[PDB]
């Protein structure tokens, strides 16, 4: 559980942790709840209650995350100092990053209470799935949910070129690492730290990017098989649980990859600032 949290610093003076399994899990039951109310035409009105329930689930989950905020900002203020013109500052960062993660681990059951509250609500609606003939079930729920909740995201992802967005950052890290070698100085220390944090950010962007590319295709393939059909009630439920899984896996990796994209370029903005100082105002 300790190696499944991602840190995001989108703006210079920002920090946010994302518990990858928690976010995937809560998203899995968001799709399950929606599919459940949208299969039966009569249960469409439930959408208001489900919307306002998921609202308070995100609200209550974020109220737990905020308990670590005092530690979070203590770490932000250390990063803020570390990027500007070192042994004690590096250990100041380590002890605070490890302290913030421990804070999160202390609320393990406090987040899983919100998770279990969601799992129970989504399963409660899912068990209320009603078919006219349990042999010939309709795939209308899968279509309204895909059209109004998933297709938009797929087209948004297909619009951007994530393989290009990776090839951009390989060139950036190629030129920063190349300049670092030529630099033969306390500036070199802070530049080697930003370059190291970005190098191990590109890995997270590349990782999430593979998930997005493969889930995009695997969702577009499975959605052609689950719509305009008359499924057996058992196979219908199994295919809803199948879809909600691919949807949860895709959304989580897209949400994180876009946070990681802004995170890489916000810190790359400050890497080129130190270059403009170490050379222009120094030589």
């Amino acid at each position: 559980i300790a190696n499944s949290i991602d840190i995001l610093q989108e703006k210079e003076g920002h920090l946010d942790f994302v518990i990858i399994p928690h976010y995937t899990f809560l998203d899995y039951y968001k799709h399950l709840s929606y599919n459940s109310i949208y299969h039966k035409s009569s249960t469409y009105g439930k959408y208001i209650a489900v919307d306002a329930f998921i609202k308070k689930i995100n609200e209550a989950y974020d109220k737990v995350k905020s308990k670590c905020n005092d530690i979070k900002n203590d770490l932000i203020a250390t990063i803020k100092k570390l990027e500007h013109p070192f042994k004690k500052m590096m250990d100041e960062y380590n002890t605070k990053k490890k302290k913030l993660i421990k804070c999160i681990k202390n609320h393990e059951n406090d987040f899983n209470k919100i998770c279990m509250d969601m799992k129970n609500y989504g399963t409660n609606l899912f068990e209320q799935l009603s078919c006219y003939n349990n042999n010939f079930c309709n795939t209308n729920g899968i279509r309204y949910h895909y059209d109004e909740y998933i297709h938009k995201l797929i087209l948004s992802v297909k619009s951007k070129n994530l393989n290009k967005d990776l090839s951009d950052m390989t060139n950036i890290l190629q030129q920063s690492e190349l300049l670092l070698t030529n630099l033969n100085y306390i500036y070199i220390d802070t530049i080697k730290f930003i370059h190291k944090e970005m190098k191990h950010i590109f890995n997270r962007i590349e990782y999430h990017t593979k998930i997005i590319n493969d889930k995009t295709k695997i969702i577009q393939d499975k959605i052609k098989l689950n719509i305009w059909r008359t499924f057996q009630k058992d196979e219908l439920l199994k295919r809803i649980l199948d879809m909600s899984n691919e949807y949860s896996l895709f959304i989580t990796s897209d949400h994180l990859r876009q946070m990681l994209y802004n995170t890489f370029y916000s810190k790359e903005k400050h890497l080129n600032n130190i270059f403009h100082h170490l050379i222009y105002v120094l030589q």
Partner: antibody, heavy 117, light 109 residues
């Protein structure tokens, strides 16, 4: 969402027609755009269906061979091509989206395609 | 493929009356019956979806009923705005959009 078809047209007998249908969504998603015609007196007559996400069109036995349904995802428009027209084809041509109710939810305004020289 | 015998063809019933249109089927259709109100000039409006579900914004007078081979459409109280031709239809995923013959409801006043 709303379906917008072309305006009326007189087509020479023996010619082909192409009735448009723009979707107000940007893409057709998993929609099924259907074409149904109403002859002079005769009731509604289903002609064909196109599911752009699938990439396959399905026609009624009567219209297999003359009708061809195409869909441009660039403009999110679906076209119906009634080739080698005859007087009998003078009718109102309609659009329809097979909605989540398993029925024709959104309908186009109609296109008065008349077959005369 | 599945014949839809919809009756009557015409209907001259007065205002504040009950009107009952019927749709039949050559084979078994579970719950796939859609009822429409085709007004002159205007494109057909979907009233009942999947044999009984009232479409959002269709008055409560209208009501789809029945299942199997015989389905019914009932207008609780005839209103002067209910003069139009009413059709039934079926969908089978094959696909199969077979249509009804058409009941022309004209008010005898």
């Amino acid at each position: 969402v709303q379906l917008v078809q072309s305006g009326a047209e007189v087509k020479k007998p023996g010619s082909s027609v192409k009735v448009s249908c723009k979707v107000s969504g940007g893409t057709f998603r998993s929609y099924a755009i259907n074409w149904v015609r109403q002859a002079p007196g005769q009731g509604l007559e289903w002609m064909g269906r196109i599911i752009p996400i699938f990439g396959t069109a399905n026609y009624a036995q009567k219209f297999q061979g003359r009708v061809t349904i195409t869909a441009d995802e660039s403009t999110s428009t679906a076209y119906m091509e009634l080739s080698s027209l005859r007087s009998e084809d003078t009718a109102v041509y309609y659009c329809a989206r097979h909605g989540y109710s398993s029925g024709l939810d959104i309908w186009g305004q109609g296109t008065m395609v008349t077959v005369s020289s | 493929d599945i014949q839809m015998t919809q009756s009557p063809s015409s209907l001259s019933a007065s205002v504040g009356d009950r009107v009952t249109i019927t749709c039949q089927a050559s084979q078994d259709i579970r719950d796939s019956l859609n009822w429409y109100q085709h007004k002159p000039g205007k494109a057909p409006n979907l009233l009942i979806s999947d044999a009984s579900n009232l479409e959002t914004g269709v008055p409560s007078r209208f009501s789809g009923s029945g299942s199997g081979t015989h389905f019914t459409f009932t207008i609780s109280s005839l209103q002067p705005e209910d003069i139009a031709t009413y059709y039934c239809q079926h969908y089978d995923n094959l696909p199969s959009y077979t249509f009804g013959q058409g009941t022309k409801l004209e008010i005898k006043r």
